[PDB]
Structure formats: structure tokens, C-alpha cells
Amino acid sequence: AMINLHIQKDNPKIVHAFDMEDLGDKAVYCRCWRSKKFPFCDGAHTKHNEETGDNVGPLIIKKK
Amino acid sequence: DHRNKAMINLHIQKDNPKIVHAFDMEDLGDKAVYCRCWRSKKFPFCDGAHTKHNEETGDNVGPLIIKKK
Ligand code: FES
Ligand code: FES
């Protein structure tokens, strides 16, 4: 059972790296691999959780 | 039976109906490496578990890194 079904399948291992300096106020990152704006969350987790009974959700990196 | 759709997170914090983590950058140090495969024993941090997931399932998931320029 794969987790990522369709994103960047020509990449054998998808890793993203960002510098905190470039982030601004808040960045919300997808952990469900269903976002159409991956690596950013676009709310797709909700339908994923609904269909599957799962409980996954995003990672938020923000300024204090 | 394709009516039963596979979960992404199999085991982590199942008493939590939707797992979200929120961190302030100032608290992150030089680098933080976050799990996006839900198999790490150190979740929400990556501990290398994605490698075994990828070999077993044919997937290509990997972590998210936040660091200083
Ligand atoms: S769209 Fe994937 S965690 Fe929100
Ligand atoms: S252990 Fe999950 S992405 Fe590395």
C-alpha cells in the first residue's frame, strides 16, 4: 500500500527543504500526499480522512 | 474489496481525530527534519523509516526539512 499515489512519480524520493528566512509568517505543509499544491496543504486531508477513517493532518511552521 | 480504502497513518496517535503539529521557527534550532510517511518512531520527526516503507511498497515519499540559509 503506497502512501503517495500520484505526486512527482519520476522522483524516486520526494524531499523538500526550505530556509526559515524564506517562509514569512506561516507555512502549512501537506502530510497526506493528496494536496494539489503539494508540498503545501490545500485541505485535501479532510476528504482523505473522510473516505478512509484516517486522522492525518498538516505541519504548520510559524513565527512566534 | 476496493470499497475499503487504505489509511496513510496506521498507528500514530489514533485517539486524536486529526493530527496537526504547529511549531514556532525560533524554537527549531539550525534544522528540523519532519516525517511525511507516518512510520517514524519519533513522529512528527523523520527517523529514516520512510526508506523501509519505500522499499516495501514501491513508494517515493521522504521528509520535509526546515532550516537556516
Ligand atoms: S492537504 Fe495534505 S495534510 Fe492538508
Ligand atoms: S521517517 Fe517518515 S519521512 Fe522519514
From Swiss-Prot, chain B:
| Keywords linked to the UniProt accession | 2Fe-2S, Acetylation, Iron, Iron-sulfur, Isopeptide bond, Membrane, Metal-binding, Mitochondrion, Mitochondrion outer membrane, Schiff base, Signal-anchor, Transferase, Transmembrane, Transmembrane helix, Ubl conjugation
- Cross-link Glycyl lysine isopeptide (Lys-Gly) (interchain with G-Cter in ubiquitin) residue location(s): K5, K18, K31, K41, K42, K52, K67, K68, K69
Any one GO BP annotation for this protein: regulation of cellular respiration
Explain the post-translational modification: Ubiquitinated by PRKN during mitophagy, leading to its degradation and enhancement of mitophagy. Deubiquitinated by USP30.
According to its record, how does it sit in the membrane? Single-pass type III membrane protein
**UniProt entry tagged with the keyword Translocase:** no
Kindly list the positions at which N6-acetyllysine occurs in this protein. K18, K31, K67
Q: How many cofactor units bind, and how?
A: Binds 1 [2Fe-2S] cluster per subunit. The [2Fe-2S] cluster is redox-active and pH labile and is significantly less stable at pH 4.5 as compared with pH 7.0.
Q: What is its main location?
A: mitochondrion
Enumerate the Cytoplasmic topological stretches. 1-69
What is this protein's record name?
A: CDGSH iron-sulfur domain-containing protein 1
Q: What's the source species for this entry?
A: Homo sapiens (Human)
Complete protein: which residues are present? 38 to 106 of 108
